């Protein structure tokens with residue numbers, strides 16, 4: 001059982017492990033900007049965007065009350081990238097690498 005005030009110390013190492021993957025985490029560090037990136041259909045396809053900076057802000061500022069909410073946002077981020085990007089694409093393959101790192105880091109914590 002985690003109390004809300006324990007979540008950052010327990011879960012931040014799993015998020016730091018994702019950020020440490022370079023270049024794999026770079027497309028995930030900030031919200032997808034469809035006009036900037038030249039992908040104007042992004043928000044037509046992806047209904048609930050999520051990225052590392054949003055997860056980090058929520059974890060820093062006490063917006064998560066239970067660990068499932070953090071895990072849920074991490075999988076939202078990965079599933080959005082698998083949904084929007086083609087299986088052959090750089091971002092999709094980076095997503096798969098990050099998801100493998102995440103599974104290895106989150107399992108001992110939970």
Ligand SMILES: COC(=O)c1ccc2[nH]c(=O)oc2c1
Nearest residue numbers: 066067068069070071072073
């Ligand atoms: C999207 O998932 C959920 O709405 C949800 C809600 C409560 C939970 N309690 C738990 O342990 O996992 C949960 C998952």
Ligand SMILES: COC(=O)c1ccc2[nH]c(=O)oc2c1
Nearest residue numbers: 027028032037039081084091
């Ligand atoms: C999580 O980041 C994406 O889903 C993403 C990022 C950069 C991209 N550049 C592009 O052409 O598609 C992209 C998709």
